[PDB]
């Protein structure tokens, strides 16, 4: 096969999938395969794009024997994968060793779940890739107006508060005072005010 990746920490590829569902629950997901790692890219309404990356270091074996092209693009449906890997995950406590595979354009995306007794094999049909390119929705790296590094828990709590107050629209304030003060706020328009 032109690409083969084997792992046992399936919780990593499960949380990676659980990070993709927010960007639509039934549509096409683009998978980019190169030597560095495996990346999933999803775009919604040409206004937002998400790009997770699973490095080769997350897999014991990462062959990528493809030589004619440096990178391989495939488009598959996310509802097939989510509906599949749900019933597979019924007995996830078992020592499962996921094996991703792709043999090139026209071949399906294979996802083998072997438990040393049962080897479930799921082949996902690959679809044609749409016209929109994911490199359009990227920031220009020479025009940054603000660069904030924030913790994960605080941002998650702020987002959960914005969700609980409704927050139809949102604002981001970023001011650095001269003395030592840095101001970062997430102002919201909602039912409250």
């Amino acid at each position: 096969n032109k690409f083969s990746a084997s792992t046992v920490h399936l919780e990593h590829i499960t949380t990676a999938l659980s990070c993709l569902t927010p960007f639509g629950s039934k549509d096409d997901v683009l998978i980019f395969i190169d030597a560095d790692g495996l990346s999933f890219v999803r775009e919604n309404n040409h206004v937002i794009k998400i790009q997770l990356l699973l490095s080769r270091e997350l897999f014991m074996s990462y062959s990528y024997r493809n030589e004619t092209e440096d990178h391989m693009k495939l488009c598959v449906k996310i509802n097939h994968i989510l509906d599949s890997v749900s019933v597979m995950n019924r007995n996830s406590d078992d020592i499962v060793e996921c094996t991703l595979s792709y043999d090139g354009h026209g071949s399906p995306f294979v996802l083998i779940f072997e438990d040393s007794f049962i080897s479930e094999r799921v082949e996902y049909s690959t679809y044609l890739i749409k016209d929109f390119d994911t490199n359009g929705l990227e920031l220009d790296r020479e025009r940054i107006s603000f660069e904030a590094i924030i913790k994960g828990e605080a941002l998650h709590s702020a987002l959960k508060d914005l969700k609980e107050i409704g927050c139809k629209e949102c604002y981001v304030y970023a001011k650095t005072e001269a003395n030592d003060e840095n101001v970062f706020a997430l102002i919201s328009k909602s039912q409250l005010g």
Binding site: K77, S84, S116, F117, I118, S119, E120, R121, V122, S125
Partner: protein, 292 residues
């Protein structure tokens, strides 16, 4: 037509399970049953080709073509007396499985209540009744289940299907009590977590590899088995239904010597046996539901 027998569960704990497996699987299969009380072997038969009162709309609106042909030796029961003017004293009957199964549940529960009382089965005189009687340990339980006396000419029409062996490849399924038994049972019932699967494409490739392929979903699923499998004795495949696989799952769960017989695009035969020591073989003949 003198038919009398007595069964005592405690003395032999294997023949009772052998009989219970037939009385349960026939009831699950279809309504009513045939009991061929030959002079030496009891042959409980569940067939849509006959059964007289089980041949209404079997292979007509549901595709029920499954034929189970079990065999109970005479040594299972305590007294095996068969008197009939037919050849080898053959007494073929046809009664419902509902009352018989309920009676067997009652007897099994009476056993579970701490009793050693036996059960007496008689034929109290072409429609008759079965005089099932037993007690607690002196409460009386009498069940006169209706039964019939299906004719010898009708008996002759009930012949076991003749399975060829030109392309048949047997597969020795592992014993449930073994280490791989639980894993194989889980692999067998794994196809049951998808409620939208009606047909199962069995596959065996010769150390043989047993493979289950499902092609009724948006994705192509292949349920494989990498464990050890023995072939008592080219890929032979057959498409069967899901209920015909559930009953095979139950039969494998209830037996140890289980053989999976696969005819290429013709049939699938589930041969179960119980070597008590002659042997209480349970045979289910399943026909292809689609073409390969």
């Amino acid at each position: 037509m003198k038919l009398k027998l007595i069964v005592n569960g405690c003395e032999a704990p294997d023949d009772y399970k052998l009989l219970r497996t037939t009385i349960n699987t026939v009831a699950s299969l279809r309504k009513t049953a045939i009991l061929r009380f030959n002079s030496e072997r009891l042959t409980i038969i569940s067939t849509p080709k006959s059964s007289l009162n089980s041949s209404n709309n079997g292979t007509i609106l549901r595709g029920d073509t499954g034929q189970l042909w079990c065999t109970i030796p005479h040594d299972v029961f305590r007294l095996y007396t068969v008197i009939s003017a037919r050849e080898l004293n053959t007494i073929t009957m046809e009664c419902n499985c509902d009352s018989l199964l309920s009676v067997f549940k009652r007897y099994d529960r009476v056993m579970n209540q701490g009793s050693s009382s036996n059960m007496t089965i008689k034929l109290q005189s072409p429609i008759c009744a079965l005089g099932i009687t037993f007690e607690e340990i002196v409460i009386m339980h009498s069940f006169k289940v209706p039964v019939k006396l299906l004719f010898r000419a009708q008996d002759t029409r009930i012949q076991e299907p003749m399975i060829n062996y030109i392309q048949l490849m047997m597969y020795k399924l592992p014993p449930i009590s073994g280490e791989f038994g639980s894993a194989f049972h889980g692999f067998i019932r794994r196809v049951e977590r998808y409620s939208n699967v009606n047909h199962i494409h069995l596959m065996g490739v010769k150390d043989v590899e047993l493979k289950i392929i499902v092609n009724e979903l948006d994705w192509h699923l292949e349920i494989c088995w990498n464990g050890p499998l023995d072939s008592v004795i080219s890929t032979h495949e057959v498409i069967i239904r899901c209920k015909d696989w559930k009953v095979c799952s139950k039969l494998y769960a209830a037996f140890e010597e289980v053989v999976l017989a696969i005819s290429h695009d013709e049939s699938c035969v589930f041969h179960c046996s119980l070597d008590r020591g002659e042997r209480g073989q349970i045979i289910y003949y399943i026909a292809r539901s689609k073409g390969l």
